[PDB]
Amino acid sequence: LGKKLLEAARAGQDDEVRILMNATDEAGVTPLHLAADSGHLEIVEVLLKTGADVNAWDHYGFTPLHLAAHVGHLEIVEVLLKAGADVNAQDHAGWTPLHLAALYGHLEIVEVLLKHGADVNAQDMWGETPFDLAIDNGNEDIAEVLQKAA
Amino acid sequence: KGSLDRLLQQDKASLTRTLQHRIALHVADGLRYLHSAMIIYRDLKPHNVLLFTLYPNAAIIAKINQQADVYSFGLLLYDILTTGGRELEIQGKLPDPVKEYGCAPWPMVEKLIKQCLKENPQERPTSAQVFDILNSAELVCLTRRILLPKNVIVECMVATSIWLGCTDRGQLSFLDLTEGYTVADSRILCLALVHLPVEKESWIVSGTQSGTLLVINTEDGKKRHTLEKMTDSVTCLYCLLVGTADGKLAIFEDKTVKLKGAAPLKILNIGNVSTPLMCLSESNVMWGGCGTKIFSFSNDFTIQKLIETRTSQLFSYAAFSDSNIITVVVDTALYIAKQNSPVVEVWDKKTEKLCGLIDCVHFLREVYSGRVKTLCLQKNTALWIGTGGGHILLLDLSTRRLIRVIYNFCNSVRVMMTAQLKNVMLVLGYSCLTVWDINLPHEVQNLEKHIEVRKELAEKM
């Protein structure tokens, strides 16, 4: 049932879809969460229309924008802010999707979220901004656009 | 069998640390009872402890204004930690225990004395709170705790005096455990020691982002030489092995380090630039991982098995699984920690397939980031797990059950490994360095069992 759906979303159900008639797990993984890791596109076009929660964070604390900036994607983010996902949701370590984007050198993603109303003064308990995450990993290209939009 | 004057007078040797934290725990378990049923003492002294029979693993070892009693108990604890000391009594200006009396360092008691010795009879901790803080393994063992100045962040360290590897110019800091701490264009990412007992000299070698390996000795930093590995950022040294960022690994003969710019015995390549080799562990068969895949050595320095750990992504998050290996520790099962991953997996060295998972955040949420940083394996059966936040995890390989979530007094933890200083831990995190006794989990279990037994006995009486 729910376990099968959340495990298959990682592999990709494609055809199987879901009950033409948002269960969680002991690990807290929702179908959108498990789906945005593998980075499929049918997932958020056949499950968002059903009504799957745009923001259903995990025990780690992971909105499906943190995952989309984690794995590295364009279409998933472009789609998930169409529904209006919180661009300023915070991880349990205080990571915003922009933070994870600057952590993995995705210029496209920081450009996308910044035009959608993403902040640059987001904070964690370590007191690090996405500019700091970008420079620390050596991706000064993202830090350039962050400073330009600062 | 005696009173708490003779052993403080003559029997100084038998006053072991675990016995030292058995009297005060037992005294504060009587002072708490006294203040519970509205009594006062005003003469709490070592002369009124009168131990029964002194040896650590004992059910009972010693037993006897309201807030003026806590000051006397703090004085007693000071005279317990300092095995000696015979207007200054109520002064609040006594010397620090290890500063003048020369006792063995022991934090969380050297601080408890200060907390209970304040010259204000309104905010010194109540006896219940003082016993509550006193009974804790983090207090009992915690061999040392060294602190480092601001903006001296570090990410690599090695035992021997402890070498610390730290701006955009690589500088290393020699730390001695005294305690006065003290050379490349690129910062030193990883660092390790090699030993040559034949020539009674030890060469300490550090890896740099520019790849300029350094050869210096521990007795003096004058005789310096370099190797010629280069070609990437050295990410792991082990004793000599080198793990770069392109997956290449360079074995080195023990006696080649003295020669300037010595070539590796044989350059071994694993993968590409996107796959860095950053972990090497001792089992005589080496083990290690690069990018997302594990391998194995032999006696002739050739890969024998090569398992793909990308297949772990069928479980947990792909964002965690599709990451580089940080560290590997090889017991009968294989433990590898992924980059920025709060999930540690268990790999079977025989069937070459996954056999278990360890969820660090699942243990952490019962007591702050959860993302694993380092792994440490201790002797027969005790597993030490780091965490991105300020945390330390203890596991029991017999059943993979949590022992005690030790909370490091720092924002984060970076690197830890075993040491032989008496065997000790070396936990480092943002920057503070904490030294723990190897027997921490068995000590937790023993103290919990002894406290349960004593509580049962007290309930009986």
Author numbering:
A (entry chain C): 16 to 36, 43 to 171
B (entry chain A): 1952 to 2015, 2051 to 2072, 2085 to 2158, 2166 to 2171, 2174 to 2184, 2186 to 2190, 2194 to 2250, 2263 to 2306, ...
Task: Provide text from the study.
Leucine rich repeat kinase 2 (LRRK2) is a large multidomain protein containing two catalytic domains, a kinase and a GTPase, as well as protein interactions domains, including a WD40 domain. LRRK2 is a large multidomain protein. Its N-terminal half contains armadillo, ankyrin, and leucine-rich repeats, while its C-terminal catalytic half contains GTPase (Ras of complex, or ROC), C-terminal of ROC (COR-A and COR-B), kinase, and WD40 domains. LRRK2 forms dimers at two interfaces: between its WD40 domains and between its COR-B domains; these interfaces are important for LRRK2 to form filaments on microtubules, which is enhanced by high expression levels of LRRK2, in the presence of LRRK2 type-I kinase inhibitors, and with overexpression of most PD variants of LRRK2 (3, 6, 7, 8). Here, we report the identification and characterization of the first high-affinity LRRK2-binding designed ankyrin-repeat protein (DARPin), named E11.
To do this, we prepared samples for analysis by cryo-EM by mixing LRRK2RCKW, GDP/Mg2+, a cofactor of LRRK2’s Ras-like GTPase domain (ROC) and DARPin E11. The resulting cryo-EM map and model showed that DARPin E11 bound to the LRRK2 WD40 domain. The binding interface between DARPin E11 and LRRK2RCKW is located on one of the faces of the WD40 domain, adjacent to its central cavity and opposite the kinase active site. Two insertions connecting neighboring blades of the WD40 ß-propeller (which contains seven blades) are particularly prominent in the binding interface: the helix-loop-helix motif connecting blades 4 and 5 (residues 2339–2351) and the partially disordered insertion connecting blades 5 and 6 (residues 2388–2414). The area of the binding interface, calculated using the proteins, interfaces, structures and assemblies (PISA) server, is 877 Å2, a value that is similar to what has been reported for other DARPin complexes. (i) The backbone carbonyls from LRRK2RCKW residues Gln2342, Leu2343, and Ser2345 form an interaction network with residue Arg25 from DARPin E11. (ii) Several DARPin E11 residues, including Val50, His54, Asp58, Asp79, Tyr81, and Leu88, form a deep pocket that accommodates the side chain of the LRRK2RCKW residue Tyr2346. Furthermore, Tyr81 and Tyr2346 show π-π stacking, highlighting the importance of residue Tyr2346 in DARPin E11 binding. The overlay with our LRRK2RCKW:E11 complex showed that the presence of DARPin E11 was incompatible with the formation of the WD40:WD40 dimer. Unexpectedly, we found that binding of DARPin E11 to LRRK2’s WD40 domain decreased preferred orientations on cryo-EM grids, allowing us to solve a cryo-EM structure with improved resolution.
